Design a protein around this ligand. Sequence first.
Ligand SMILES: [Mn+2]
Ligand SMILES: [Mn+2]
Ligand SMILES: [Mn+2]
Lengths: 411, 428
Amino acid sequence: LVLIVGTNPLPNYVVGSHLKEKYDKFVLIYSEKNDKINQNSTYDYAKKLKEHLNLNDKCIFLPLSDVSNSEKIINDLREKFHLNYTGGTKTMVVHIYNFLKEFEGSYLDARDYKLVYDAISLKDTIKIDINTLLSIHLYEDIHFEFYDTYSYKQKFVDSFDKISQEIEKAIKDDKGEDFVKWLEDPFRKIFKGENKLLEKTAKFKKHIEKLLKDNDSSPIVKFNEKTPQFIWDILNAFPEGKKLNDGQKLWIPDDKITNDNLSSRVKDTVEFLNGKWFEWYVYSQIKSELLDRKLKEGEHFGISLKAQKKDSPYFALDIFLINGYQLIGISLTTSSTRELCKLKGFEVIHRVRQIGGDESKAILITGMDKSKTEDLQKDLAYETGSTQKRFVVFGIDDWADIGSKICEEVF
Amino acid sequence: MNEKVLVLIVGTNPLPNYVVGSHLKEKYDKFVLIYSEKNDKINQNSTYDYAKKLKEHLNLNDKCIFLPLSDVSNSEKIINDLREKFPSEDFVEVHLNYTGGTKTMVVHIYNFLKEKFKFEGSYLDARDYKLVYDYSEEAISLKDTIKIDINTLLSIHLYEDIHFEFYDTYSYKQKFVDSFDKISQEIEKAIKDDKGEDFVKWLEDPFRKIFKGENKLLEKTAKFKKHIEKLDSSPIVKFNEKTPQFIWDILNAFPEGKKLNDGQKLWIPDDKITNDNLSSRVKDTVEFLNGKWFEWYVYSQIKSELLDRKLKEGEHFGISLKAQKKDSPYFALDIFLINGYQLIGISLTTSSTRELCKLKGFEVIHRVRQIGGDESKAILITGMDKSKTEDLQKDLAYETGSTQKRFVVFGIDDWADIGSKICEEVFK
DNA sequence: CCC
DNA sequence: CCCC
RNA sequence: AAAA
Ligand SMILES: [Mn+2]
Ligand SMILES: [Mn+2]
Ligand SMILES: [Mn+2]
């Protein structure tokens, strides 16, 4: 079994995991680093493949000084040496399929998830976890949260379930559109102003005063009088020390309220209601189904995934999901705005590519109507050669049944 | 008679086939474009739209033969489709450039045209811009030979309704006639004097606290008055007392009818100021100072160095590019630049916030890949410091097999010499 | 890294 | 139209 | 894994 090590390590891991039991020795062709010819090395991917495929003594590393020149290829192939030709450049594939012949040949079809011999579907045969997937793509310090280790369960203890159930009831009663509009106005008009607004008692008090310069038109009036009943019930499901409501009105802090007391009461509550809630909602709707499909939490799905390349910044991904050996990254936002949603679309498309390879699927769930979501999908669509979409946008109309929506899209 | 044929494999990246065709059309008489056919059962999309664009922008006419393949991943079906559809006419030289298509297509097409036949196989190197012949052992550099314009580049990637702006037709030269040159020169002086950081921080506070907030703030006298009422911590005093001198100069470079200052102080409308009077004075000035100016500044610091390299404006560079796929939303790119056959898209922002600049980074990465192919380069110019600039480059870096970066970020410390920095990054 |  |  |  011979493999060509390009910049996408996942196809070689899938083929290697399958065609290791039937083989003895393993050769991996990798490129060298020549900054002059703008050629980087895939040796790091070749090492990850050996480690994650357990090939300590059977593995042979063959370096090619130039993967774009047949002359320098064969010269390097001469001095040192079932071919799966799925990876590497076109030259590497030609001048190795022929050099070695001068003999079975395989190829992993990224479109139908089948290894083809010069057949066998591997979509429900070869499996991978989140740690192995990000490791072969060179990411480390992987951490995520479980259903029972969710961060906000520790912040609103003894009240989270009531809070989450109340929000879940509203969304399943098709109130998600009403919730978003109230979040835009007046919620974000009171609790989203300047930086450190909810951390300095004076900053918040000044903001509240200036808001009372419009009287009945002031957003605090919309909060007090024109707030729907299901939103009050959500607000009142929070602990009294973490409530944004003073009984049935907007809480105005006296100057005696310390900065840590204001922050300890408002900050966690505002950030959750301004969007983090939607992360938990979707994840809870998904976990109620994926377990029936034998997926294991922490191995094949989870929430708040974070990792980094070596000495490099961390990324944040709301939800990850592995179906067979395809990564499905899900980005979540309550925004109904085209600018932000588009940018969020660019982000999730690039992230799943970085951590799961070029055949990963990105899903963006927004608070936009059906027309805006179709426009965004077309705007960000990129041609990969497949009929199935690798970027999918959902909208406010999908929130109530988002669990089955994602199940149909992923599986 | 002695008919010589060139064979190209139509993958999802049309640019390499256009470059190979533009360089080899003169040497061959027939051209066979092997493309894929759509079959949803095997999740196989078709690349025929690219092969059709290749015939159009290469002017192949009837000397073009379209050879469809049913399954780009099945060795047997490819071999059968090739035998029943490759031209059996006796040729003298058969040249296959196997740069595109799937790995399976490349394997068997190369062998099929190896047994049937003079023969020569070629491959275009995306890393060092070199066409490698498999038997001539020549490696011709096409980086300075084959050229492409913005219209043909976006067209072969299936985009249309392309429009952009020129140096002389720039939008704000139409809005600030006579005064634009004075406004632009004063700003360029301060930036080339390393006053970029000061300007940015002054734009964040107190400029954006005064002229940015509610919608239609600067077009409604009542909304602007209430805003000023709400504002010794107010940004108005920071404007009237703390505003630096080079900013007073660029503010005074505006016409007195379009100036935000009322004479070393903030102009506050009286109660006889119409809504239209307010917007006519400050709207264009605020929007130009909040960021539009930076687009013109960067474009002006590069136009000279681009013309010196014999690039033609409108075809190889331009400002405010816009295009769309058929019946699809439009994109907007601040600056575009084509070096040989490589697109360089430049997104510009004066923001120093890490989150907004990160999102702007994802944007320019995706757009240049959509309109220019997978070997395009994206540049993001920000008002961030070098440490955050370098952090963003590593955060968004994607490995494709090159040593040179395909996503570059520049920061506030590059503004004074941004022309040379772009020149060295693009041309090397 | 919510918006 | 997408300046921040 | 359809200019690695
Ligand atoms: Mn494991
Ligand atoms: Mn999110
Ligand atoms: Mn811009």
